[PDB]
Amino acid sequence: GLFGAIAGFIENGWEGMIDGWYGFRHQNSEGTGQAADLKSTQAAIDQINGKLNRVIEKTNEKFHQIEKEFSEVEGRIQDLEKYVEDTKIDLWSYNAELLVALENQHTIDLTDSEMNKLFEKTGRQLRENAEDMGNGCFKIYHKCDNACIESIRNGTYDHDVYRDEALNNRF
């Protein structure tokens, strides 16, 4: 993707995460855990649903048209009737092919973007208390129990509480 997270600096996906599209895995003194992130998951789902509803919106209702199959040879007028319908079909076939190609390229990029945004947002929470390991994980340089991990996942983590401990361990 354009942002380098999905199929990028994140090596692979998590088949074990079945309750969200993006989330956190942690390791601390009390063990390991996993939690999906709701806001980033919902942002990707809302964009794709909106794109999908615009695409499948029923907007074509036609009634009496032109004939398109013929049992006898007629020449000029039938040549034109066939050419008109063949021209229409090719233009709509082109529209449909380009549409799914543009939409899919954008869907892969927007979901890549949401992953990168969540990563950058998390690193901004940790400030000088953590370092980017380059593989989607942060090394946190202070004791961080379950309540501390939960404060990162719900966005209330105050970096200043742990800064003195973290700066000392880092340097």
Ligand X SMILES: *[C@@H]1O[C@H](CO)[C@@H](O[C@@H]2O[C@H](CO)[C@@H](O)[C@H](O)[C@H]2NC(C)=O)[C@H](O)[C@H]1NC(C)=O
Ligand Y SMILES: *[C@@H]1O[C@H](CO)[C@@H](O)[C@H](O)[C@H]1NC(C)=O
**Given the complex with a second copy, which of 13 and 123 has the nearer CB atom?**
123
d(CA 22, CA 9): 15
Q: How many CA atoms lie within 13 A of 56 on its CB side?
A: 6
39 and 46 in contact (C-beta within 8 Å)?
no
| Binding flag, residue 38, other proteins (CB under 8 A) | no
Q: Which residues of 75-95 are buried (b: 16+ CB within 10 A; e: fewer)?
A: eeeeeeeeeeeeeeeeeeeee
Size of the site for a second copy (CB under 8 A): 53
52 binds ligand X (CB under 6 A): yes
Residue whose CB is less far from ligand Y, 125 or 151:
151
50 vs 123, beta carbon nearer ligand X:
50
DSSP characters for 104-115?
HHHHHHHHHHHH
Task: State the nearest-atom distance from the C-beta of 112 to a second copy, in Å.
Answer: 9
Residue window 140-169: x/- pattern of binding to ligand X, with contact defined by CB under 6 A: -------x--xx--x-x-------------
Write out the binding residues for other proteins, residues 138-167 only, by CB under 8 A. 138-144, 148-149, 152
Q: Is 58 in the site for other proteins (CB under 8 A)?
A: yes
Residue 133 near a second copy by CB under 8 A: yes
Cα separation, 146 vs 28, whole angstroms:
8
Query: In Å, what is the CA distance from 9 to each residue of 35, 54, 66, 145?
Result: 20, 33, 56, 27
Q: How far is the CB of 107 from a second copy (least distance, A)?
A: 12
Q: Is 100 in the site for a second copy (CB under 8 A)?
A: no
- Residues forming contacts to ligand X in the complex (CB under 6 A) are 52, 69, 147, 150-151, 154, 156
